[PDB]
Write a protein that binds this ligand. Sequence first.
Ligand code: B12
Ligand SMILES: [Cl-]
Length: 414
Amino acid sequence: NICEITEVDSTLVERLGQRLLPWMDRLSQEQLNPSIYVGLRLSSLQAGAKEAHYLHSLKLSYQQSLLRPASNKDDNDSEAKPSMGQLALYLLALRANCEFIGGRKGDRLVSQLKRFLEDEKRAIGHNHQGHPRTSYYQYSLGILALCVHQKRVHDSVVGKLLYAVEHKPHLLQDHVSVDTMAMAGMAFSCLELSNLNPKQRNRINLALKRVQEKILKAQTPEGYFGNVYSTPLALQLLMGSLRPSVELGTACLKAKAALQASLQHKTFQNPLMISQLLPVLNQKSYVDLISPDCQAPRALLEPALETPPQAKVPKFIDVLLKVSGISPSYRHSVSVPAGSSLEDILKNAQEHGRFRFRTQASLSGPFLTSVLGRKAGEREFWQVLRDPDTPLQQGIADYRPKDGETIELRLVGW
Ligand code: B12
Ligand SMILES: [Cl-]
């Protein structure tokens, strides 16, 4: 397929996999990541005996956290439960090991996911006013995860996603847009291939064409679909063909070229990003989880085991931190070694000054939730920008500021 990546340098692929490798040893509840496991299984690489151990740890964690103790011992909280979107990714990890969800525990998890989607459908409502409590991204992911296990949702559930894709100047905010379209597209694709909602067949077919149209519309002059980090998900979808056009073929050539050029510059550091990219580089997508091949050999991944000693005096950078959207504005000047993350900078400011911040765990790493005591509310988030007004494309743990940058933390409501 013209949208498939064929010409990748194997040593670049190995380098990407090597970044995932140490995560295979990070087995705590808040570090376990079903997306990383899926990513490796659909790649051309393997982390040996570490993989099965990782999946056993996922099985233990998700099952014990999400299932039972009915009369919960004086708390109603303490454990750090995975979310329902995270449960969907867990269902994808099972498929990646060529398993179907089964037994009583399995049926219980399936019910919890179906209930999540039903609660989301009702939050949307009558089709008009109402957003999901989470996102259309997670809604799409839930449908897809049930679908690859051959579990059906009601026509009305699929209907809310179809409507969201269909109706006018579209619902989707710019940040989520390409990624959500790609994930919606993959759900539709699974539903079409599996014939789970036959009464919606034609509507699903048309929505698939519409998703492709919107993704192409979002191609940047560089050739990314949306941005570099949404390009792997979009290519996961577009490799699934359907409607081959010359416009699509041309778009895909530009996108693969842009993605390849970006890989030459160590662009992908975030494990979750790598996990979405590795399948594309092996001509696979989440839709392949309908009938996975666990018999196909993968190349063994070994660590670097070297680590570069300069024995030097490092270059320093001067950065200005700024906080806006709260009543008294805050600014902080720090000088740090070149290569320090924004997270390091925030920790430095908290240590050597009156800055304070809090994060919560996510599959993408530390998510910024509070700044100077102000926790982000219900439909609010702490947006991270390079001044002026340019939202960053990496989170706090991965963004490495350059000399003389002013970074802004802005409480916004989207
Ligand atoms: C929906 C979404 C959001 C929502 C999430 C809130 C909501 N109502 O759900 C909002 C709008 C708040 C958001 C914010 C941001 N996002 Co966002 N987001 C997504 C999206 C579309 C889906 C995430 C999801 O639900 N995944 C599934 C569930 C099961 O996973 P999860 O880990 O449990 O989900 C949580 C995290 O993803 C977290 N989150 C969302 N975005 C980001 C980004 C980072 C870096 C981290 C650590 C966490 C995080 O919110 C989710 C819980 O609500 C992804 C797309 C993708 N390809 O993954 C982008 C994506 C993860 N976001 C991205 C970015 C860059 C950001 C921001 C840094 C943008 C900015 N400059 O402020 C901020 C985060 C800043 C912060 N406060 O730490 C990038 C990350 C790229 C990279 N190199 O890692 C992605 C890949 C999109 C893209 N193509 O650029 N995001
Ligand atoms: Cl990254």
